[PDB]
């Protein structure tokens, strides 16, 4: 958030367990969400585009919403990660310490499934926002609509791996099935949608 | 630039500033790909368990870290090259052939810059494979996030090659660049999927 890019890449490169893939996914996300706001901000007020203005106004509120949130998620990853390690590194001597570690690990893995899925959900919304500027956007900047979708799609599939990892560790299979089923679906659509919107933009560029 | 904060970059990326742009974003997408290949490498070197792949991952670590440094620089290279295309079209019969020359000059750079980022992102994808095979099983997810961030960069940057190639007189140049471009692209689809499935099946 309040942190240099080279700083983030130094830490992301380092042997520190954070930043890692989860935080990158979120950045891949918030970049998607930014490149929609861009095509919105450079198409709105353009006299030749006063028949899509209002739509692209509504898109802009959504995308700015989703950028704010997705920037939050860079650090939500670290919180979720700490929770898992905090639980995993608990005393393990008596059965009063064993049992209270099982529970706290389960509680931690559930949070470390919801938090990446929340980013998935927002990344899948970003792909929908990009379809719209890929179809209504100023042709001068139509590429940004294409980079937008690729970033969002990278975010979604990135974040999705942190769902698979923490999901598999759960004792409550019910809760996991629901979450993996919610992911399984988010990904079904996003596959062909990212190509459509990437290939559409490629065509509008030539 | 990579000197900017993640909020300051995103505040400008979202704005109606012509910079930052999708070329900026593609640069960052690549660096994080390099960054993550370096992180698996850093979390596998000095694990006694992973001695057999230590030297191999040592050679990968130095490659990735050079690709990261390059790709981070390429954030600014995109703004510089785009600002000189904006600059050439801003120019005011002698006044008019001066301007069509400067523009063609500017658009050949505006093609070469994103193709280099394309070239580098393609190389992150190969290191993202070695690490996906040889890397520490408790951070293999990062091998995955790597391949994705790198593939996004590649195709994000591909689009800026197409935008600038389109407006070029010299068509021997332009088609030579589109051939190179489509020569990287051709493979990148096939790897990115093989690598992700491989990382997907190691976490599950």
UniProtKB/Swiss-Prot annotation, chain B:
Q: Which InterPro entries match?
A: Cyclodeamin/CycHdrlase, Formintransfe-cycloase-like_sf, MthfCyhylase
* Topology class, membrane: Single-pass membrane protein
Offer one Pfam family short name for this entry: FTCD_C
Q: Provide this UniProt record's keywords sorted from A to Z.
A: Hydrolase, Membrane, One-carbon metabolism, Transmembrane, Transmembrane helix
Q: Which family does it belong to?
A: Belongs to the cyclodeaminase/cyclohydrolase family.
Q: Which NCBIfam families match?
A: MthfCyhylaseFchA
Q: What does this protein do?
A: Required for both C1 and C2 metabolism.
By what name is this protein known? Methenyltetrahydrofolate cyclohydrolase
